Design an enzyme around this catalytic site. Structure first.
Site, PDB file in Angstrom:
ATOM      1  CG  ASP E  47     -24.992   6.160 -25.142  1.00  0.00           C
ATOM      2  OD1 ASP E  47     -25.642   7.153 -25.490  1.00  0.00           O
ATOM      3  OD2 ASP E  47     -23.931   6.340 -25.616  1.00  0.00           O
ATOM      4  CB  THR E  80     -31.176  -4.240 -23.481  1.00  0.00           C
ATOM      5  OG1 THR E  80     -30.450  -3.213 -23.877  1.00  0.00           O
ATOM      6  CG2 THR E  80     -30.553  -5.315 -24.276  1.00  0.00           C
ATOM      7  CB  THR E  81     -33.671   0.677 -23.934  1.00  0.00           C
ATOM      8  OG1 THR E  81     -33.854   0.477 -25.179  1.00  0.00           O
ATOM      9  CG2 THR E  81     -32.416   1.100 -23.646  1.00  0.00           C
ATOM     10  CG  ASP E 381     -25.869  -6.013 -29.958  1.00  0.00           C
ATOM     11  OD1 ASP E 381     -25.686  -7.072 -29.350  1.00  0.00           O
ATOM     12  OD2 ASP E 381     -25.831  -4.652 -29.639  1.00  0.00           O
TER      13      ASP E 381
END
Lengths: 201, 129, 72, 200, 513
Positions: E47, E80-81, E381
């Site tokens: 993840d 963020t990925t 988030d």
């Protein structure tokens, strides 16, 4: 970890480690395939150095088996899950996944989107569960023609103690009904070890 | 950890130990009696008609050689003697059939044979006992 | 034809299963469809020929892991 | 203490309390216990060996009987349940189409391996078993039913499918539906990575 | 020297190199990663978000990305990925055009006008929603609570993700909703349905035992002083060579302090937050026994979080030693509330305190940090999502799917720029559509069918449509329940922009020694 290695921690980086994991996982899963069933050949398996365990029970072995792979982790994990779950399927859950972990991920990247791949197993993992739960066609202690006696006999007949299915067919019928321990939440089931079972040579 | 092994490779190593176990004592067993010598790492002789001695005194070959001293002490407890017999009988019975039958490839029909000979033992014994 | 054969083959399998007339890939169109209806058209006998040719070509050889070779 | 008070509330109620010695074994028999129905079966062997056989052969039915008390649905032990499922779902692959077509076969075609291995373990092997299993199942026989022109059962100890439809050597649907979910999870579980990396 | 040549690649290389194997993202792809380090220490990783933060990288432009990984978190908390995966995409355009001999400053120039073009077209395809509208706050957070940890719990958190904001949000459109704004404090015990929006400034703290104040009207303390006592702040007239003398110094200690702890209470204090440091031991724990017996909450060597918020939201100042009493600069408190739910955790709930019009507190509860973090990571988030909607309104699709709409639309402007950068601006305008394909990446064999299908069909979604990378299949990605706020990715562009541009600014030889 295969080929010239610039990285540690089970990085063959992708299909390699994927394969190496399906190499890893299945290399565990093979002990069961022969160990499957009591006729399944036992394995004398050193626990430490001179401590040998003789077990054809897979997840029992998979507790002896130690986890050096993410593949090694989960199969020991999931079979030990099924192990503490029941004890029926400890062996069994180990066998097919080695192929099932040899299959879907190949499609999972063939994804239009990755989800539809495993659902081919999943609704099939349902479609079977349907078909499974649909099966009264064998394994009936729910009813025989003499009800449990013949079923207990068919049990004892599927076995051999010597001459059996005679007082023992009847004996199984007693044992549960001999138990007035009412298993919680209205379960019409009687613990079979709650029976007083005595023995004469 | 993660490990798997195969069949005759594990099956032959049995005989490989089991045979050697069965070997010198059958010359030691009975009226014909021989000395099974051990050369110590220390360099000393140990001369026996008993296998368990030289067995215990030396490197243990894991699959077969660990098994028999046990069934030896199993047997050594039973009537008090016959460790030599058990260890030679098993490896004997383990040898010619197996590969033959395991090139014919089957565990089980071999297993039922162990009992019948053991049964063919019992009766004609107690017949001719 | 620039396709993925699998899901092409997949559906046409199903579309010979749930289907079952001619459903199949067409490179002419670069599509899939009933091909006889797509007018993908060759006589049958050439099939049987290749069939007989293919099924016979193998079976001989699988019966041979044993091949003698001599300069003499 | 020996002078400790005692009352009649400790009296057990049976029709009679008798002690019968038999086989060179005697017990205190509480006959027709009045608080709760009670029963104990005493095994008879030729030796103490025979009893561990009968006892556990019983125990095969026993726990299953209770496990059938746990599940009315009770499904054939042995991969003959799968040899059906290894085809019907293999069929349930194609007409599905696309990737699960691909996948559902991967599911079913792999359901074949349990009976092969198991009977190989019992030296009943594969083709025969897998023939016999799916010789039962047909297109004419697609249905679990209860009846066998499709025998969906497989004796585990035999490794070859047999006539035991009632036996306590077969597992109910309890222990079955799970490992399906279990094993596929393993195929799922390994997947889960996002962003393969290394720490140093 | 050829070093600036060789290293700028090595810069781009080990930057992109690590970053390239970093794309497994968005869905059950590849197979799980168990990391055992160069020191040989087992970690089991997955993840990539955490992995991005886990990321341990040799080489600096690889270390640039761990930063860049964290850069997206506080800017968005989403994708963020994204900024990490697309980092190679700029790094891509570098070499190819560096190969082309395009002066990297031109390539560096190529980033902004692009970043000027690019984020705009994202705003051009953006899907307008509100910052204060609980539904628009819900949905964006909903999809950001759908695939995040809790969903069933988010049904409680999604509104609290929303409910926290309407406090924090300053009227209508306002620059607002920071991480300092919603106060996120773990609470030991309870569960996520025990996680609740606990309004205002609620100070999580370790208060010694109980017999404490749960009672209304605290004077919430900030205390830099010791109770001045034998063996605390005041001289001991008794030297110990003796067990009669050694038993004497603690008695004069404990008998004395009992007056100050009440006087500590006499301000009305149901809290005094001890100085974080020690004056000697600072406040004796024998003192802190009787401080709480007078119902005054004490966390000795208080954690940093309370000190500020109490000086910030509540606005509390230190006060004089209670021998001098206090300056009544103890912040506004009508309560000191220490609640044990599951029977677990000690707390300070301050309601009736000064508050900016911000600092809503969420008290995140669970039988363990698992259940806690379950709620926490999800709601955070969901806040940060709503936060993005606040900070920048409208919407974009989740998982870089809108970037392909940009790629099509932008490349034209890249093209029609027809400048030295336009080439580069075209080259990198085409480095977007890779990202959904490249997240598909690690799982399998007979492989390659969908790669450009992960691309073409979007390009054949006109400029308005493409495959949903979250949910699957083509739709108009921007609102599918494949969504992130417009703010999220326009930062990922900017964030990765100058980082890679800094790589073009690497010349000659640098190792500081």
């Amino acid at each position: 970890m295969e080929g010239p290695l610039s990285v540690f921690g089970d990085r063959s980086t992708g299909e390699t480690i994927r394969s190496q994991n399906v190499m890893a996982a299945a290399s565990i899963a093979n002990i069961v395939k022969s160990s499957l069933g009591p006729v399944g050949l036992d394995k004398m398996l050193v626990d430490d150095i001179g401590d040998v365990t003789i077990t054809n029970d897979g997840a029992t072995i998979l507790k002896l088996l130690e986890v050096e792979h993410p593949a090694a982790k989960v199969l020991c994990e999931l079979a030990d899950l099924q192990d503490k779950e029941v004890g029926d399927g400890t062996t069994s859950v180990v066998i097919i996944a080695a192929e099932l972990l040899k299959n879907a991920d190949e499609l999972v990247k063939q994804k239009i989107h990755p989800t539809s791949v495993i659902s081919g197993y999943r609704l099939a993992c349902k479609e079977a569960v349907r078909y499974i739960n649909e099966n009264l066609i064998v394994n009936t202690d729910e009813l025989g023609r003499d009800c449990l006696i013949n079923a207990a006999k068919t049990s004892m007949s599927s076995k051999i103690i010597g001459i059996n299915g005679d007082f023992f067919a009847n004996m199984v019928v007693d044992a549960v009904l001999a138990i007035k321990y009412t298993d919680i939440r209205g379960q019409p089931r009687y613990p079979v070890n709650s029976v007083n079972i005595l023995k004469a040579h | 950890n993660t490990k798997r092994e195969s069949g005759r490779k594990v099956q032959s190593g049995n005989i490989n130990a089991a045979k050697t176990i069965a070997d010198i004592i059958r010359t030691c067993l009975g009226p014909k009696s021989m000395m099974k010598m051990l050369l110590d790492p220390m360099g000393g002789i140990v001369m026996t008609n008993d296998g368990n001695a030289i067995l215990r005194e030396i490197q243990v070959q894991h699959p077969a050689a660990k098994s028999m001293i046990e069934i030896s002490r199993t047997q050594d407890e039973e009537v008090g003697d016959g460790t030599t017999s058990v260890i030679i009988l098993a490896g004997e019975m383990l040898s010619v059939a197996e590969h033959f039958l395991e090139q014919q490839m089957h565990p089980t029909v071999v297993i039922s044979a162990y009992r019948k000979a053991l049964d063919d033992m019992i009766s004609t014994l107690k017949k001719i006992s | 034809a620039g396709f993925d054969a699998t899901n092409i083959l997949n559906k046409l399998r199903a579309r010979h299963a749930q289907g079952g007339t001619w459903y199949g890939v067409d490179i002419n169109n670069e599509d899939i469809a009933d091909n006889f209806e797509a007018f993908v058209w060759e006589p049958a006998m050439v099939r049987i020929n290749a069939l007989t040719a293919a099924s016979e070509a193998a079976c001989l050889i699988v019966s041979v892991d044993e091949t003698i070779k001599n300069p003499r | 203490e020996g002078e400790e008070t005692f009352e009649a509330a400790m009296l057990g109620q049976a029709e009679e309390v008798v002690q019968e010695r038999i086989c060179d074994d005697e017990l205190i028999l509480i006959k027709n216990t009045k608080a709760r129905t009670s029963a104990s079966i005493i095994l008879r062997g030729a030796n103490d060996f025979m009893c561990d056989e009968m006892e556990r052969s019983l125990h095969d039915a026993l726990c299953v009987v209770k496990r059938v008390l746990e599940s009315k649905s009770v499904v054939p032990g042995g991969g003959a349940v799968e040899a059906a499922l290894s085809i019907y779902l293999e069929n349930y692959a194609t007409s599905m189409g696309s990737r699960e077509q691909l996948a559902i076969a991967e599911f079913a075609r792999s359901l074949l391996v349990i009976p092969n291995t198991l009977a190989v373990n019992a030296a009943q092997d594969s083709t025969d078993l897998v023939a016999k299993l799916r010789a039962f199942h047909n297109e004419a026989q697609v249905n679990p039913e209860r009846k066998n022109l499709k025998w969906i059962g497989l004796d585990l100890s035999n490794g070859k499918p047999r006539d035991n439809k009632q036996a306590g050597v077969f597992e109910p649907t309890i222990v079955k539906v799970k490992s399906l979910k279990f094993a596929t999870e393993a195929a799922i579980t390994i997947l889960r990575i996002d962003d393969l990396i290394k720490l140093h | 020297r050829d070093k600036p040549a060789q290293i700028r690649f090595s810069n781009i290389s080990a930057a992109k190199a690590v970053a390239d194997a970093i794309r497994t993202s968005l869905g059950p792809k590849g197979m799980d990663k168990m990391i055992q380090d160069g020191k040989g220490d087992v970690t089991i990783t997955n993840d990539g978000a955490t992995i991005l933060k886990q990321m341990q990288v040799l080489h600096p432009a690889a270390r640039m990305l761990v930063e860049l990984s964290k850069a997206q978190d506080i800017e968005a908390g989403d994708g963020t990925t994204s900024v990490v995966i697309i980092a190679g995409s700029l790094l891509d355009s570098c070499t190819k055009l560096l190969q082309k001999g395009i002066h990297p400053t031109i390539i560096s120039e190529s980033f902004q006008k692009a970043l000027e073009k690019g984020i705009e077209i994202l705003t051009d395809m953006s899907r307008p929603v509100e910052l204060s509208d609980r539904e628009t706050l819900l949905n964006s957070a909903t999809t950001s609570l759908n695939s995040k940890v809790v969903s069933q719990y988010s049904s409680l958190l999604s509104p609290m993700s929303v409910n926290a904001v309407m406090k924090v949000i300053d009227p209508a459109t306002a620059t607002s909703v920071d991480l300092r704004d919603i106060k996120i404090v773990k609470k030991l015990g309870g569960t996520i349905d025990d996680c609740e929006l606990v309004e205002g400034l609620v100070l999580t703290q370790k208060v010694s035992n109980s017999g404490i104040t749960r009672v209304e009207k605290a004077k919430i303390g900030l205390i830099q002083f010791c109770l001045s006592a034998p063996k605390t702040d005041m001289d001991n007239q008794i030297v110990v060579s003796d067990y009669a003398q050694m038993d004497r110094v603690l008695r004069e200690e404990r008998a004395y302090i009992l007056n100050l702890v009440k006087q500590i209470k006499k301000t009305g204090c149901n809290v005094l937050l001890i100085q974080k440091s020690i004056l000697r031991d600072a406040l004796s724990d024998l003192a802190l026994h009787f401080l709480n017996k007078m119902k005054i909450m004490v966390i000795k060597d208080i954690e940093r979080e309370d000190i500020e918020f109490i000086c910030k939201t509540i606005g509390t100042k230190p006060v004089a030693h209670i021998d001098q009493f206090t300056a009544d600069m103890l912040g506004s408190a009508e309560l000191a509330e220490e609640v044990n739910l599951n029977g677990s955790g000690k707390l300070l709930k301050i309601t009736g305190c000064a508050s900016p019009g911000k600092t809503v507190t969420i008290v995140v509860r669970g039988s363990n940090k698992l259940v806690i973090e379950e709620a926490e990571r999800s709601i955070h988030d969901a806040l940060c999502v709503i936060r993005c909607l606040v900070k920048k309104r409208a919407l974009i699709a989740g998982g870089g799917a809108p970037e392909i709409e940009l790629a099509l639309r932008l490349t034209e402007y890249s093209r029609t720029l027809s400048g030295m950068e336009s080439y580069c601006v075209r080259a990198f305008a085409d480095a977007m559509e890779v990202i959904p394909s490249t997240l598909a990446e690690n799982a399998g064999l007979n492989p390659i069918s969908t790669v450009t299908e992960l691309r073409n069909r979007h390009a054949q979604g006109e400029k308005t449509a493409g495959i949903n990378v979250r949910k699957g299949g083509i739709s108009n990605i921007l609102e599918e329940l494949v969504v992130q706020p417009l703010l999220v990715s326009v930062s990922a562009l900017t964030l990765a922009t100058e980082t890679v541009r800094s790589i073009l600014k690497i010349d000659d030889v640098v190792n500081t020694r």
